């Protein structure tokens, strides 16, 4: 399938060059997987998540998202314009106020959440979760991380915006996990993004156009932006059968562009997500 026109991010993920603007994927688009949005919450019944996405958890007054973070995640994961897995099932749970904010005990909450709610839906294909949050490090929120991981779900997490050593914030310093750094349109490292050693994978994050609260639109930038991306990207592979919950990170990384980013600090893997379609 081709999407015509569609954000540089889509066509980065399925090309062998950056400056293209087509998005193609196999149609089967990650129908029957399932991508837990852990966040600020979506705004499920915006268009472009066609009744795909419902809110399962909030730890706050409302399940609705009044920040537009989590519905700008989801979108990248699977809105019908702006996702990578278009026919996946998105689930919402609220660990972030509309501040974006959250104590690491909701956190941690959140993701035991997840390793449990699984068993309550259908998702024959496999299971992600997608984690665009993150704060200083902790061996408590990297242990929860590594237990939703070791559950049977693919986890992805934001490396950080710090500039900096991913080794000092969590979760995207636990090994476990797939860590996720942002690249730009001229695949240069995100001036913004953090690097090291813990990095699995870079994906688009600067300037990514996805869905916001209130129905509309609209273009950011972070790490939080990368890991749908990957997240969306391992739906995508596990609806084609590619790989496994527990083996989607090394996979992505296995079957990546490589060598392909600049300013990537020695040390640091030189691999950009990519879906390897041949249409």
Not at 155 to 181: F, I, K, L, Q, W
Not at 202 to 209: N, V
């Amino acid at each position: 399938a081709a999407q015509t026109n569609a954000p540089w991010g889509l066509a980065r993920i399925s090309s062998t060059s950056p400056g293209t603007s087509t998005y193609y994927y196999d149609e089967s688009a990650g129908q029957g997987s399932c991508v837990y949005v852990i966040d600020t919450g979506i705004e499920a019944s915006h268009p472009e998540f066609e009744g795909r996405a419902q809110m399962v958890k909030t730890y706050y007054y409302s399940s609705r998202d009044g920040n537009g973070h989590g519905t700008h995640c989801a979108g990248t994961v699977g809105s019908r314009t702006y996702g990578v897995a278009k026919k996946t099932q998105l689930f919402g749970v609220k660990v972030l106020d509309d501040n974006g904010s959250g104590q690491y005990s909701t956190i941690i909450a959140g993701m035991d959440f997840v390793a449990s709610d699984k068993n309550n839906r259908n998702c024959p294909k496999g299971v992600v979760a997608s984690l665009s949050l993150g704060g200083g490090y902790s061996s408590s929120v990297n242990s929860a991380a590594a237990r939703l991981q070791s559950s049977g779900v693919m986890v992805a997490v934001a490396a950080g915006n710090n500039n900096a050593d991913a080794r000092n914030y969590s979760p995207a310093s636990e090994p476990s996990v797939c860590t996720v750094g942002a690249s730009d349109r001229y695949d240069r490292r995100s001036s913004f993004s953090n690097y090291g050693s813990v990095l699995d994978i870079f994906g688009p994050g600067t300037d990514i156009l996805s869905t916001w609260i209130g129905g509309s639109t609209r273009s950011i930038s972070g790490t939080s932006m990368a890991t749908p991306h990957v997240a969306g990207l391992a739906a995508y592979l596990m609806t084609l059968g590619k790989t496994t919950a527990a083996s989607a990170c090394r996979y992505i990384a296995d079957t990546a562009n490589k060598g392909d980013l600049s300013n990537i600090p020695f040390g640091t893997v030189n691999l950009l997500a990519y879906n390897n379609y041949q249409a």
